[PDB]
């Protein structure tokens, strides 16, 4: 089974951490080394990691029953959530460094309600299936992330979407997160797919893989016959190679900037060239 990536322009794909279209390619700031996103995580042979779902209709969503004080979560299909198999139910939002505003609707009832989520209080324990209701009346709901705002705590902190929230523990390993992703070094930096997120600010949500890439990989289940996949970022109109890229088995892309990838057009297509060694040196973009 030969390895392939979707033959679709990036500008036509979606973010994997929220249902938003991809608007740019980017790299992290200097002070951002590793990232530990729990959504948008899939290996090159199609194994989903963290809370990543197959389809975008599960991304950044919640489902549960409120009693006025807490929301007891379930999985999005209504089946019970079993703790300690992951940090949260599949599709749960993983946006740290901000306050969440989730649009809640119901099956069989009218109207929508804004659910304001602070991810810092002791009540916020999604890994045990419980989060504070914060005024949401009793009933069964399904919610989707609608917009974000600066985190309530620490007061005055700026939005930082390079982080994931604390899923409710004093010990990092207790929540069984997907492992962190580090830049390989030697000039290679992580490649992120950005989307503009509604809210009172110029919010740019980074993710490691487009959601359409994830469902493609999970469907293909191609054997990872190498340590890294050499890619070409191709302009579909011209056919011209705009830059060399490497995709690693854990499910992330890297490149060597020359100014660099953030100046690349977003209407290009990633094409698999060949399997190469992890030490393959890329030409600067």
């Amino acid at each position, epitope marked *: 089974r030969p390895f392939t990536l979707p033959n679709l322009p990036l500008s036509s794909l979606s973010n994997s951490r929220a249902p938003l279209p991809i608007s740019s390619i980017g790299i992290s700031p200097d002070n951002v*080394q590793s990232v*530990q996103f729990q959504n948008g995580r899939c290996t090159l042979d199609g194994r989903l990691v963290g809370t990543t779902p197959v389809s975008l209709s599960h991304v950044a969503k919640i489902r549960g029953t409120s009693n006025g004080t807490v929301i007891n979560l379930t999985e999005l299909d209504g089946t019970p959530f079993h703790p300690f198999e992951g940090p949260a139910p599949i599709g749960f939002p993983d946006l740290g460094g901000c306050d969440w505003h989730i649009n809640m609707t119901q099956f069989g009832h009218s109207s929508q309600t804004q659910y304001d989520v602070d991810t810092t*209080p*002791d009540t916020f324990v999604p890994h045990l299936g419980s989060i504070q209701a914060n005024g949401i009346g009793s009933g069964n709901y399904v919610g989707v992330l609608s917009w974000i705002s600066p985190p309530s*705590h620490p007061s005055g902190s700026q939005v930082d979407l390079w982080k*994931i*929230p*604390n899923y409710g*523990s004093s*010990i990092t390993e207790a929540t069984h997160l997907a492992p962190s992703v580090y830049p390989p070094g030697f000039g290679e930096v992580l490649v992120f797919f950005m989307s503009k997120m509604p809210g009172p600010g110029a919010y740019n949500l980074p993710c490691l893989l487009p959601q359409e890439y994830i469902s493609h990989l999970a469907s293909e289940q191609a054997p990872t016959v190498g340590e890294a996949a050499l890619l070409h970022y191709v302009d579909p109109d011209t056919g011209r190679n705009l830059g060399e890229f490497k995709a690693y088995p854990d499910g992330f892309l890297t490149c060597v900037p020359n100014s660099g990838p953030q100046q690349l057009p977003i209407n290009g297509v990633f094409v698999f060239v060949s399997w190469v060694s992890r030490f393959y040196q890329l030409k600067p973009v």
Partner: nanobody, 121 residues
Framework: QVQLQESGGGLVQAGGSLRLSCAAS????????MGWYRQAPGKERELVAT???????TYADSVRGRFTIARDNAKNTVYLQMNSLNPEDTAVYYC???????????????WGQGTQVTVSS
């Protein structure tokens, strides 16, 4: 694991003084503000005092002037000196801290076990 250990508290006559301390320990990556909260039986937990990593303070209106919050950044320890106490100050006091477990994760609020403060009249 993150742990908050409190010391101090106890019984005091009206008008007297008490001192509270709380030390933060465990594996962590960053620590923001630390503070003191109190809760009497039949009421909700309310803020008493907060101190930032820089040293910026916030006080409840009911304790402004009487209480003093201090912090030793090098020891990750917050201190509370309560003066001119009244019997309405009787509650269980809890230290609080917003701690970042790792570089990749956002802050979380952690609490201590709680110290009883009883002011007689």
């Amino acid at each position: 694991q993150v742990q908050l250990q409190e010391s101090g508290g106890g019984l005091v006559q009206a008008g007297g003084s008490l001192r509270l301390s709380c030390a933060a320990s465990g594996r962590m990556f960053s620590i923001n503000s630390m503070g003191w909260y109190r809760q009497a039986p039949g009421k909700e937990r309310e803020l008493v005092a907060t101190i930032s990593e820089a040293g910026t303070t916030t006080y409840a209106d009911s304790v402004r002037g009487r209480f003093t919050i201090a912090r030793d950044n090098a020891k990750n320890t917050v201190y509370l000196q309560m003066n001119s106490l009244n019997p309405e100050d009787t509650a269980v006091y809890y230290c609080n801290a917003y701690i970042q477990l790792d570089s990749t994760i956002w802050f979380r609020a952690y609490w201590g076990q709680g110290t009883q403060v009883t002011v007689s009249s």
